[PDB]
Design an enzyme around this catalytic site. Structure first.
Site: not given
Ligand SMILES: *C[C@@H](NCc1c(COP(=O)(O)O)cnc(C)c1O)C(=O)O
Ligand SMILES: [Mg+2]
Ligand SMILES: *C[C@@H](NCc1c(COP(=O)(O)O)cnc(C)c1O)C(=O)O
Ligand SMILES: [Mg+2]
Lengths: 319, 319
Positions: A28-29, A53, A78, A80, A83, A115, A172, A204, A208, A210, A273, A304, A307
């Site tokens: 992106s410019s 995933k 959770s 992804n 799916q 699925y 970098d 993170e 959360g 941790d 977009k 990542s 959805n």
């Molecule tokens: C595995 C978990 N999905 C997580 C997720 C992450 C974080 O991944 P890590 O848990 O550290 O491997 C980052 N971005 C997105 C969009 C998602 O779903 C699951 O779905 O069970």
């Molecule tokens: Mg965490």
């Protein structure tokens, strides 16, 4: 604990080459001018099933022998990984049982059932999903394919970063979203290979953190399920495999607020977009927060996933 | 009237190669399974300034001599050509004056002003923007670069389809959004070259079907400014250059309702994870409406743009 190395990530590229998307890299410019840098976004929101995933799921299930495949697999997610596992399972003709949080985005639950995955739910903030997974699989003789704390799974996730480096060269800095650590650990393995001097950052949501705590402390820190819109990063602690790698190949763990996530989500829609789920906004939100440090540098941003429930997404865009 | 041919589109590819994006081509398993066909989406919503217009603007302005460039240019646009012209002008150091509809998406007006374009507004439903353009340019000695009825402009727009065919080969059908006809005419030239037997379809919002009427009648039909959310296709009639080409190289003109556009916009966000403006949803909305005809075929879908006010976009997604 035998840790996977870059070799496993490279081998994972081969196992998934048949069904995975070689997601595009966007630039992106506005971003480059704003950051005074070259920023490359790896779009896993364009991956099969809408998130990165698929890579780990397919790499893992593809390494199951005939008996294991027929016996069926089980997982907890959770949404992804749920799916991705369901899709991968259908492709390989593997029966799949999935344990999902009751408050998971309806779009994720629906795609999983579509699925062909058998869904069972748990209370994200009070139930012990791993205990449920273990017992159920032990009772039904099913192979557990963890959402992140597994060598094949995390090695697979690392193929996204591998493609990013092969397409644009050393960077970098690389920002990666952090839940259980599968994506970050896999990405760190790729980074150390293609660009040993790349700064690898895990991100993170603040509630959360941790992972951040673990990284500072030197041991795994456990927290109560965090309340945040980053529904894909509400893990209570890092995985053992993932932390062992994160501990040695990651440079820092950052946090951002849900407020920062929303601004990032609006930015992606408006300026680039693309639809990005809250959890997919962690890496860029952090990068923006430290733009001063990225001046005259080449930065990689992992997107990542994308959805989200449209209704929920519309609501975020309205803030 | 000397009409541009495919040669001009090919020459346009060279003039813009320095600044334009070679937008990616996306595919969807849901769409292909739903349509029982192979569907390829050319994503101009990822083009510079968020729409395909950059191609025509740059190709046109690049062919201005030193005196013309210094003298400055003028144009009238619903917003995307306005942005494209402003961006192209800044790059070439050309002063630019732009006439925009008062009810244009605020994001389009803002980007135009940000790129350095001097904006003047008109009432889309009652003012004669061309009369305003002519007089202003005549009075100020400015070169008018039309939003579509100009050989260089339309030839430029055709470079998107050119890239689509070069990347995936001949197609059985190509759906293109239709306003004044620059995109459709340019695309038709590319189609006739790469795939002379491709069915080329123009798509207009039902309330603004002057193009369709013109195509049936054999002459340009004029209508009052149509009321529709497809803010980029509210033209009152087709251009002379564009219609001359559309008349000979286009197979049919279809229409879709705003309701169909909204469903398509939600589909793009939810299933393909991309932000598409209402006008950019015309081509796919029509294709869905005639899926039966596309069975076991290869279809090309032009995604013309993604410039929308986020607030407005959130609202559409909420329907
Ligand atoms: C595995 C978990 N999905 C997580 C997720 C992450 C974080 O991944 P890590 O848990 O550290 O491997 C980052 N971005 C997105 C969009 C998602 O779903 C699951 O779905 O069970
Ligand atoms: Mg965490
Ligand atoms: C030129 C006009 N933009 C229109 C537009 C179209 C239709 O193009 P044609 O008018 O027929 O050439 C299709 N999709 C989008 C997103 C837009 O903007 C302008 O901006 O002045
Ligand atoms: Mg019309």
């Amino acid at each position: 604990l035998v840790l996977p190395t870059y070799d496993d990530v490279a081998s994972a590229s081969e196992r998934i080459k048949k069904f995975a998307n070689k997601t595009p890299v966007l630039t992106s410019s506005t971003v480059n001018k704003e950051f005074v840098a070259e920023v490359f976004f790896k779009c896993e929101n364009f991956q099969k099933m809408g998130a990165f995933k698929f890579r780990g799921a397919l790499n893992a299930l593809s390494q199951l022998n005939e008996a294991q495949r027929k016996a069926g697999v089980l997982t907890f997610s959770s949404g992804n990984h749920a799916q991705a596992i369901a899709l991968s399972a259908k492709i390989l003709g593997i029966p799949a049982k999935i344990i999902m949080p009751l408050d998971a985005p309806e779009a994720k639950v629906a795609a999983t059932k579509g699925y062909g995955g058998q869904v069972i739910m748990y209370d994200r903030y009070k139930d012990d999903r791993e205990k449920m997974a273990k017992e159920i699989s032990e009772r039904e003789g099913l192979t557990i394919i963890p959402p992140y704390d597994h060598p094949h799974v995390l090695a697979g996730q690392g193929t996204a970063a591998k493609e990013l480096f092969e397409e644009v060269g050393p960077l970098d800095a690389l920002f990666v979203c952090l839940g259980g650590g599968g994506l970050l650990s896999g990405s760190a393995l790729a980074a150390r290979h293609f660009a040993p001097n790349c700064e690898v950052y895990g991100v993170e949501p603040e509630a959360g953190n941790d992972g951040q705590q673990s990284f500072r402390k030197g041991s795994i820190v456990h927290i109560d399920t965090p309340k945040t819109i980053a529904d894909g990063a509400q893990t209570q602690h890092l995985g053992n495999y993932t932390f062992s790698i994160i501990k040695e190949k990651v440079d820092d763990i950052l946090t951002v607020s849900d407020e920062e996530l929303i601004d990032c989500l609006k930015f992606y829609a408006a300026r680039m977009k693309i639809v990005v789920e809250p959890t997919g906004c962690l890496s860029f939100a952090a990068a923006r927060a430290m733009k001063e440090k990225l001046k005259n540098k080449r930065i990689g941003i992992i997107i990542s996933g994308g959805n989200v429930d449209i209704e929920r997404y519309a609501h975020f865009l309205s803030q």
